[PDB]
Design a protein around this ligand. Structure first.
Ligand code: NAI
Ligand code: FMN
Ligand code: SF4
Ligand code: SF4
Ligand code: SF4
Ligand code: FES
Ligand code: FES
Ligand code: K
Lengths: 430, 44, 213, 263
C-alpha cells in the first residue's frame, strides 16, 4: 500500500465513538464486543502476545513503545507477588480528548481490553486510573463494569474460562503528572504524584511493588479487536512499524473540531481538510500546527503540506507523534502567547520532585512571559535554547522533555518573529 | 430500527455527588479476596 | 493559595468533622479494593469523599482520614496540598472552573472568563458574597475539541459562547440544574457539519473474526 | 563469587550485583557530586546532580540510583557529564538566596563547594527569585527555608532513622515547600541531626547560630559521656572556647549521628 487515509467505517475499531449507539452491554454486544472472549482467554498468554506483536501495535500512550514487546516483559513466573494491568486513563495532555471518548462511549471495549490484557500478562486485577475531572465518565465506566460483573463476564470465573479477574476504577485528583506511569503508580499507592526512577521498570516494581503494566486506554481497548480480527489485519493499515488505526483530535483553529478514528499514516492536510473541514480561513490561513498535543514541538505551514501523521514521519519532521492531537493555529494567533501559556501549563502541572524541571520550567515561563511582551534582547533566545538543553534528558520523567520540546520548536521555527517582537518593544519603550 | 441522529448517552444527567461511590459500594460484593503483604502496613 | 496552615477559629483540629455512617460504608467499600498491607492507598478516594461530604477540607478531615487509615497526618497533608481538587479553603456551592490553556485560548475562552467576571461581579479566585459561585481558572480539562468549556462541580459545559454561559449562570441562580453538554448544534464530539465518519451501521458479532477462534 | 566487571574511565573494577554507579566510582577513589544521595538514607534521585555518562548510551544516568550493568565505561569527566553538572548547578542556584555571608553554612556548605568545583562561574537568571516562608520546628533547629533546595533528606531522616514521619513536601512545582504544614515542633531525640545532613543552610543549629564560622574552628576528636553508648564526636572550638559538637563516623557505635543531648 502506498496511499493512506480515507478509512472505511467497517474497519473502525471504535464504533459508537460518537455516542449515537447504546454504550451499555446490549449495545456493545450488538457491535461485536464481548464476542468469543472465552476462546481468547483459553488460548493462553503466548497466543495473545503473538497476536499483539504480529499486529505491529505500538504505544498509543504517546511514546510508541512496542506494545507486545512491552507486555511480554510480564510473561515471567510468579514470586509470591501478584501482577497488575493498570490502565492509564488520566489524559491531561492539551489537545487530547480521545480517552474521554473511549471511556464515556465505548466502556465495554475497555473492560474486555483489561480482561484480555490481564490474561496476556498473567495479571490479577485491573486498576483504571481515571482522571478526577472525568467524574461522569468514571460513573459511566462503573455502570459498565457493573454490567460486566452481573453478566458473569469478569470477576470470579471471567467469561466461564476458569480465569479470575477483577476490574477497579481509581479516580485521580487533578494532576497532569499523574498521567506518567510511575507517578500514576505513586498516585494509586496513596502518595504524591511524584514519578519513580527507571529502572526499576513497572514490570518489575510497579503498583504496590508488584509486577505491573501501565497501558493507555487506546492500546488496551483495541487489543480484543486485534485478537478477534487478526494481527495481519491491524498490521495492514499505515506504514511498516507504524501499523494500525489511530484516534485523532483535531482542535484549535479549525471549522469543525472533532475526534475521529483514522488510518495511521494519513497526511495532515487531508485529515484537517476532510474531517475538520479545513482551517478557519482556508489552508492558506494556516500558520502552525502542534501535531500531537502540547509535548510535541510545533511544525510550520511549510511542513504540514506533505507530512504524515504517524510516529516516524513526524520524527523525520523533528517533532513527535505523541497523543495524535492536532492543534491548529491560524494567522490570527499570537503564537508566542500560546507557547508561553503552554509553558505556564507545564509549570502549573509539574510535581516539583527533581531540580531541572522544578526550577527551569518556572524560569522558562518567566523568559517566555517576557518574550510575549518582547522585554528582552535577542541573545536571550539562544540562552533559553540552552536552558531547554539543560532540561531535555536530565530529568526523571518526560515532562521536563515535554516542556523543553515546545520552546525548542518555537525558537527553531519562529526565531525572526520573536526577534521583531523584541525589537519593536525596544524601540517603543525607549 | 437503526438510529444515527440521537445521543443515547443521557445517563450522566442524573448522576449525583455520590454516584461513583455508590457504584463502588455496589461492586464491593462481586470481587475476589485481596492478597496480603504479610503485615498490616509497612510501618508495622 | 498558600501551602501552610494557620489555625483560624473556623479551621483547626477542633473544627467538627466526622463521616456519616453511609460514608463509613463507602469508606469500607474503598478500603476493600486495595490489598492487605497497603491500606494507605485509600487516601485519595476517602479524602475526596471527605471533600464531597463537606464541600472543602478543613484540617479535621485530613486528621480523620489519617485516623481511620492509621497513616501519619503529614502524608495526608501532602496529598491535600499536592492535588488541585482538594479545596482547603471554603469554596462556593457552584465551583466554576474555566479552562484557559492553549486549545481553549485559541477558541477564545477569555471572552467566557470576562463574561463570567462581569456577570458575577468577581474575578478569578474570588467568591461571590452569597457563597454560591467560586470562579477560578484551571488547566486542560480534556474537552479540547469541545473547546471553549467550563466545569461546574461534576459537569462539563462545552462549545460555549458568552451567551451560553450567561444562560447557564441564569439557570443556576434560580436553583435549577443545567444539562452538562456541548451547547452548540452537535451532541458530544462529532464534526459540527455532520458526521464525516461512522455513518454506516456497526456490523455486530462475528464480523472479520479470524479462523481458529 | 559473582562479582561483575565494570569500567570507570576505562579503569576496570569488580563490583557486587546491585552496586550503583556511585559506589562503582567510589571503589576507584572517585567521588560524584551529589545533593540528595546520602549513604545512610534511602535513594531519592531528585536533585539530578550525580548525572554521569555511560559511553555508547545517549543519555546521562543518575549515579545514585542506577545499578551498573556488566561492561559499562563510566565516563565521569566527559563533556556532557560536565554540561549536566553545570546545568543542574545553575538550576539549583537560580532561586537560591544571596545569603552566603549571613548564612551559618558558609564555609561548610556542600552547595558552595561543588558549585566552585563542578558548576559554572556566573549567572543567567535575570528574573525574580522565590521566597519561602520560614518554619518553626523547634528550639534546636533554626529554619530558613528560602535556602532549601528540596533534596528531601529531612523526610528520609525523619521517616527512616528518627522514625517521626512528620516532615514532608507541601505544594507542587516551584512552590513546593519542605515543612510540617502546621505549627508543629519537630522534637525527637535525634532532632538535631537534620542540621548535619542538610547540604545547604536551610536547617542551621540555633544555639550555634551566628556565633562562629568553620574555617577558624579547631577540631578535637573526643568521646561523648552523656550516655553509655560512647558516641565519637568532634568538639570544634575557636580560640579556647567550645563552639559546637559535630558527630564522627564510627560504623559500630553512632554511625554518623549523635543524640540531641550530645549535640
Ligand atoms: N497520552 C498522554 O496523555 C500523554 C502522552 N505523552 C507522551 O508520552 C511520552 C513520554 O512517556 P515516557 O514514559 O516518559 O517515555 P517512554 O520511554 O518511557 O515509556 C513508554 C514505555 O516504554 C517502556 N520502556 C521503555 N524502555 C524500556 C526498557 N528498556 N525496559 C522496559 N520498559 C521500557 C516503559 O515501561 C513505558 O511503559 C512522550 O512521547 C509524550 O509525548 C506525554 C504527555 C501526555
Ligand atoms: C508527564 C507525562 C504525562 C503522561 N500522561 C499520560 C496520560 O495521561 N495518558 C497516557 O496514556 N499516557 C501518558 N503518558 C505516557 C506514559 O508514560 C506511558 O507511555 C503510557 O501511559 C503507557 O504506555 P503505552 O503507550 O504502552 O500505553 C505520560 C507521560 C508523561 C511523561
Ligand atoms: S522533572 Fe518535573 S515532572 Fe518529572 S519527576 Fe521532576 S518535578 Fe516531576
Ligand atoms: S546554603 Fe550555602 S549557597 Fe546558600 S546562602 Fe548558605 S552558604 Fe550560600
Ligand atoms: S531543608 Fe535541607 S535537608 Fe531538608 S529537604 Fe531542604 S535542602 Fe534537603
Ligand atoms: S485545553 Fe481546555 S480542555 Fe484541553
Ligand atoms: S544524587 Fe543522584 S540525583 Fe540527587
Ligand atoms: K545544614
Amino acid at each position: 500500500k502506498t496511499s493512506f487515509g480515507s478509512l472505511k467505517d467497517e474497519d473502525r475499531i471504535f464504533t459508537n465513538l460518537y455516542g449515537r449507539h447504546d454504550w451499555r452491554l446490549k449495545g456493545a454486544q450488538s457491535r461485536g464486543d464481548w464476542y468469543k472472549t472465552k476462546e481468547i482467554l483459553l488460548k493462553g498468554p503466548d497466543w495473545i502476545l503473538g497476536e499483539v506483536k504480529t499486529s505491529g501495535l505500538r504505544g498509543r500512550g504517546g511514546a510508541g513503545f512496542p506494545t507486545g514487546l512491552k507486555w511480554s516483559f510480564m510473561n515471567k513466573p510468579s514470586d509470591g507477588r501478584p501482577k497488575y494491568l493498570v490502565v492509564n486513563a488520566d489524559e491531561g495532555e492539551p489537545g487530547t480528548c480521545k480517552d474521554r471518548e473511549i471511556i464515556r462511549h465505548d466502556p465495554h471495549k475497555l473492560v474486555e481490553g483489561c480482561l484480555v490484557g490481564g490474561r496476556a500478562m498473567g495479571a490479577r486485577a485491573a486498576y483504571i486510573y481515571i482522571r478526577g475531572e472525568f467524574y461522569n465518565e468514571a460513573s459511566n465506566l462503573q455502570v459498565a463494569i457493573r454490567e460486566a460483573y452481573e453478566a458473569g463476564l469478569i470477576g470470579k470465573n471471567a467469561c466461564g474460562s476458569g480465569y479470575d479477574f477483577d476490574v477497579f476504577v481509581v479516580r485521580g485528583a487533578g494532576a497532569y503528572i499523574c498521567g506518567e506511569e510511575t507517578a500514576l503508580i505513586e498516585s494509586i499507592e496513596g502518595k504524591q504524584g511524584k514519578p519513580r526512577l527507571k529502572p526499576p521498570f513497572p514490570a518489575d516494581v510497579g503498583v504496590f511493588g508488584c509486577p505491573t503494566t501501565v497501558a493507555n486506554v487506546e492500546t488496551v481497548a483495541v487489543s480484543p479487536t486485534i485478537c478477534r480480527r487478526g494481527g495481519a489485519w491491524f498490521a495492514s493499515f499505515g506504514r511498516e512499524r507504524n501499523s494500525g488505526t489511530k484516534l485523532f483530535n483535531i482542535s484549535g483553529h479549525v471549522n469543525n473540531p472533532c475526534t475521529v478514528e483514522e488510518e495511521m499514516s494519513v497526511p495532515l492536510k487531508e485529515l484537517i481538510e476532510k474531517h475538520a473541514g479545513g482551517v478557519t480561513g482556508g489552508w492558506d490561513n494556516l500558520l502552525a500546527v502542534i501535531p500531537g498535543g502540547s509535548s510535541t514541538p510545533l511544525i510550520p505551514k511549510s511542513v504540514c503540506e506533505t507530512v504524515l501523521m504517524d510516529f516516524d514521519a513526524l520524527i523525520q519532521a523533528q517533532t513527535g507523534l505523541g497523543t495524535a492531537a492536532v492543534i491548529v493555529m491560524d494567522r490570527s494567533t499570537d503564537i508566542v502567547k500560546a507557547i508561553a501559556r503552554l509553558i505556564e501549563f507545564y509549570k502549573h502541572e509539574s510535581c516539583g520532585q527533581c531540580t531541572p524541571c522544578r526550577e527551569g520550567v518556572d524560569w522558562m515561563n518567566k523568559v517566555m512571559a517576557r518574550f510575549v511582551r518582547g522585554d528582552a534582547r535577542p541573545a536571550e533566545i539562544d540562552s533559553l535554547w540552552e536552558i531547554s538543553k539543560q532540561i531535555e534528558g536530565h530529568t526523571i520523567c518526560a515532562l521536563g522533555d515535554g516542556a523543553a520540546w515546545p520552546v525548542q520548536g518555537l525558537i527553531r521555527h519562529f526565531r525572526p518573529e520573536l526577534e521583531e517582537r523584541m525589537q519593536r518593544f525596544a524601540q517603543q519603550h525607549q | 430500527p437503526f438510529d444515527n441522529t440521537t445521543y443515547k448517552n443521557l445517563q450522566h444527567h442524573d448522576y449525583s455527588t455520590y454516584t461513583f461511590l455508590d457504584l463502588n459500594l455496589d461492586l464491593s460484593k462481586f470481587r475476589m479476596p485481596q492478597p496480603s503483604s504479610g503485615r498490616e502496613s509497612p510501618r508495622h | 493559595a498558600l501551602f501552610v496552615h494557620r489555625d483560624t477559629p473556623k479551621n483547626n483540629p477542633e473544627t467538627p468533622f466526622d463521616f456519616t455512617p453511609e460514608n463509613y460504608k463507602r469508606i469500607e467499600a474503598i478500603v476493600k479494593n486495595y490489598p492487605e498491607g497497603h491500606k494507605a492507598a485509600a487516601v485519595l478516594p476517602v479524602l475526596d469523599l471527605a471533600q464531597r461530604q463537606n464541600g472543602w477540607l478543613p484540617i479535621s478531615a485530613m486528621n480523620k482520614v489519617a485516623e481511620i487509615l492509621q497513616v501519619p497526618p503529614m502524608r495526608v497533608y501532602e496529598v491535600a496540598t499536592f492535588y488541585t481538587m482538594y479545596n482547603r479553603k471554603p469554596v462556593g456551592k457552584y465551583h466554576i472552573q474555566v479552562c484557559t490553556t492553549t486549545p481553549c485560548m485559541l477558541r477564545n475562552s477569555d471572552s467566557i472568563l470576562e463574561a463570567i467576571q462581569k456577570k458575577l461581579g468577581i474575578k478569578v479566585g474570588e467568591t461571590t458574597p452569597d457563597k454560591l459561585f467560586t470562579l477560578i481558572e484551571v488547566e486542560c480539562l480534556g474537552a479540547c475539541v469541545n473547546a471553549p468549556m467550563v466545569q461546574i462541580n461534576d459537569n462539563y459545559y462545552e462549545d460555549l459562547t458568552p451567551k451560553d454561559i450567561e444562560e447557564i449562570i441564569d439557570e443556576l441562580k434560580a436553583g435549577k440544574i443545567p444539562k452538562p453538554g456541548p451547547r452548540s448544534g452537535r451532541f458530544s464530539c462529532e464534526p459540527a457539519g455532520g458526521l464525516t465518519s461512522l455513518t454506516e451501521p456497526p456490523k455486530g458479532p462475528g464480523f472479520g473474526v479470524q479462523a481458529g477462534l | 563469587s559473582n562479582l561483575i566487571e565494570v569500567f570507570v574511565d576505562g579503569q576496570s573494577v569488580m563490583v557486587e550485583p546491585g552496586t550503583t554507579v556511585l559506589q562503582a566510582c567510589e571503589k576507584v577513589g572517585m567521588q560524584i557530586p551529589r545533593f540528595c544521595y546520602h549513604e545512610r538514607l534511602s535513594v531519592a534521585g531528585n536533585c539530578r546532580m550525580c548525572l554521569v555518562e555511560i559511553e555508547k548510551a545517549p543519555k546521562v544516568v543518575a549515579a545514585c540510583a542506577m545499578p551498573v550493568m556488566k561492561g559499562w565505561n563510566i565516563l565521569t569527566n566527559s563533556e556532557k557529564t560536565k554540561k549536566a553538572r553545570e546545568g543542574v548547578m545553575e538550576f539549583l542556584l537560580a532561586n537560591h538566596p544571596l545569603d552566603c555571608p549571613i548564612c551559618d553554612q558558609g564555609g561548610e556548605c556542600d552547595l558552595q563547594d561543588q558549585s566552585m568545583m563542578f558548576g559554572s562561574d556566573r549567572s543567567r537568571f535575570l528574573e525574580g527569585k522565590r521566597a519561602v516562608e520560614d518554619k518553626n520546628i523547634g528550639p534546636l533547629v533554626k529554619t530558613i527555608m528560602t535556602r532549601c533546595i528540596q533534596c528531601t533528606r529531612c523526610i528520609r531522616f525523619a521517616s527512616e532513622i528518627a522514625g517521626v514521619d512528620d516532615l514532608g513536601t507541601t505544594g507542587r512545582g516551584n512552590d513546593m515547600q519542605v515543612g510540617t504544614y502546621i505549627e508543629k515542633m519537630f522534637m525527637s531525640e535525634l532532632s538535631g541531626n537534620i542540621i548535619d545532613i542538610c547540604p545547604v543552610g536551610a536547617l542551621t543549629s540555633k544555639p550555634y547560630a551566628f556565633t562562629a564560622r568553620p574555617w577558624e574552628t579547631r577540631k578535637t576528636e573526643s568521646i561523648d559521656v552523656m550516655d553509655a553508648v560512647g558516641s565519637n564526636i568532634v568538639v570544634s572550638t575557636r580560640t579556647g572556647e567550645v563552639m559546637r559538637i559535630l558527630p564522627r563516623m564510627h560504623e559500630d557505635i553512632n554511625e554518623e549521628w549523635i543524640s540531641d543531648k550530645t549535640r
